[PDB]
């Protein structure tokens, strides 16, 4: 297959401004949200129809209860960081768990925490240790590392359990995730400032979002500077991007095993 990935996030805010959940937890399969839970709904609900159509109420019912418990731990863990830091007011706590199933069949896994949107603790499944960014992170690290049972459990979840779920969800939403929608690439030429020609290579209507685009002079990579456009959602499940250079030039586009050349 192509590189697909499963990940879930947690967000905890202390003293939230009216209309902001205290806790949010959202799951993704690549760029697609699959699940959602927050402290307001108090329900784990789907964010994709292929999740709704393929997962029985039993799943949603069980995971809501787990998330209700996981919500409360998050609040406690954040109160404990704030005490350690001597912080007052509103502060954020985040978690990101997930795995990647590569094209070659190999796998990656990750488990990281943040405090105030900055790296706090990063799990290393290969050694079963937590990388701490400071002394507060270090105090937590010493406590988390004291439960060896839990570290082995997470190594198994990331390595074994996560990959199975990703493969399950990938069959559930194959018509969406494994589809290919080729880009529609154009080149536009314009004399900008007196003496400066700007060439643009604009691609759109493509899925998956991952696209490679570059400018080449005589079939050799530009010695000069290329400006890059962000891969952006068009709103219809397709993406758009661009790459540009100043002034024999050609635009190159690689997307899902097909190479395109647009000579100028």
């Amino acid at each position: 297959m192509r590189t697909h990935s499963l990940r879930y996030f947690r967000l905890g805010v202390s003293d939230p401004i009216h209309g902001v959940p205290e806790f949010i937890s959202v799951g993704y399969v690549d760029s697609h949200p699959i699940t959602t839970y927050d402290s307001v709904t108090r329900q784990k609900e789907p964010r994709a129809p292929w999740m709704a159509e393929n997962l029985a109420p039993d799943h949603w019912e069980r995971y809501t209860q787990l998330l209700r418990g996981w919500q409360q731990m998050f609040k406690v863990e954040l109160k404990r960081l704030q005490r350690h830091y001597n912080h007052s007011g509103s502060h954020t706590y985040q978690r990101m768990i997930g795995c990647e199933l590569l094209e070659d069949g190999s796998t990656t896994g990750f488990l990281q925490y943040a405090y105030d949107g900055q790296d706090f603790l990063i799990f290393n499944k290969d050694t079963l240790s937590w990388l701490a960014v400071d002394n507060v992170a270090h105090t937590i690290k010493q406590a988390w590392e004291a439960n060896q049972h839990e570290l082995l459990y997470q190594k198994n979840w990331l390595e074994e359990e996560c990959i199975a779920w990703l493969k399950r969800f990938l069959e559930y939403g194959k018509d969406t995730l494994q589809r290919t929608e080729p880009p529609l690439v154009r080149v536009n030429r314009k004399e900008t400032f007196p003496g400066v020609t700007a060439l643009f290579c604009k691609a759109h209507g493509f899925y998956p979002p991952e696209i490679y685009m570059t400018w080449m002079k005589n079939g050799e990579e530009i010695v000069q500077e290329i400006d890059y456009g962000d891969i952006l959602p068009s709103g219809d499940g397709t993406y758009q991007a661009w790459a540009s250079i100043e002034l024999l030039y050609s635009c190159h586009v690689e997307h899902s095993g097909v190479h395109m050349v647009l000579q100028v």
Partner: antibody, heavy 108, light 112 residues
Framework: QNIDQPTEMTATEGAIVQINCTYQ??????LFWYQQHAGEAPTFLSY??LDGLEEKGRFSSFLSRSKGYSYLLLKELQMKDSASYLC??????????WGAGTKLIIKP | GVTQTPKFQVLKTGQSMTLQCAQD?????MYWYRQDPGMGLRLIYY???????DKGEVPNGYNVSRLNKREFSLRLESAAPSQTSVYFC????????????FGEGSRLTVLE
């Protein structure tokens, strides 16, 4: 789904006994062994989630995730080891599915 | 650890009964199981955390109350002879794979 254990086992005092446990489950998040004496509460013995054999005194518990199998091995058997041994498995929905138990009888 | 009451109870068919369970281990998740000969422990109801409960495997004939962080009581509204069993209360942190700590048990007998 299914957890399977021998109903009852009998071994002689001073010997070794292996209590086998096989599971057919939707996912795997670890396997527990608990001891339960006649008319008493179950007490935790071990937790295994990665492949291998972990020793804890005269009791050692082993796991093979590929073979979906685990064993509780009891060395230098004592009359006091006479109890029910409960096998339990955490599935993909984090539900503990408990096995019916293995009554261990110790011939002195 | 986990304190459950009563150790034994006799009930007439139709009588109401409340088993009590308390724990001072700062555990979030709490469980009510029923042990019957020939089968593994069967969950009746569980409480993932203070403020939540859900039906387990065998919830018919029972209700639960998670009164606070420490207390989780099991209610038999109209006792039936099928409810003659041994009840165990259990508690663990809310990871999902955290070790369960058990109450002493509760022999309940429902007679006509």
């Amino acid at each position: 789904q299914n957890i399977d254990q021998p109903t009852e086992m009998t071994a002689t005092e001073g010997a070794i006994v292996q209590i086998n446990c096989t599971y057919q489950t939707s996912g795997f998040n670890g396997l527990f062994w608990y001891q339960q004496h006649a008319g008493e509460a179950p007490t935790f013995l071990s937790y295994n989630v990665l492949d291998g054999l972990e020793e804890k005194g005269r009791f050692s518990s082993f796991l093979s995730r590929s073979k979906g199998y685990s064993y509780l091995l009891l060395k230098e058997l004592q009359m006091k080891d006479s109890a029910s041994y409960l096998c339990a498995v955490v599935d993909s929905n984090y539900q503990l599915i408990w096995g019916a138990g293995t009554k261990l009888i110790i011939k002195p | 650890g986990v304190t459950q009451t009563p150790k034994f109870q006799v009930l007439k068919t139709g009588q109401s009964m409340t088993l009590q369970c308390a724990q001072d281990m700062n555990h979030n998740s709490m469980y009510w199981y029923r042990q019957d000969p020939g089968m593994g422990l069967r969950l009746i109801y569980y409480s993932a955390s203070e403020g939540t409960t859900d039906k387990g495997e065998v919830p018919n004939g029972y209700n639960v109350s998670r009164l606070n962080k420490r207390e989780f009581s099991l209610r038999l509204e109209s006792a039936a002879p099928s409810q003659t069993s041994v009840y165990f209360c259990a508690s663990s942190p809310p990871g999902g794979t955290d070790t369960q700590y058990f109450g002493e048990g509760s022999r309940l007998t429902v007679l006509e």
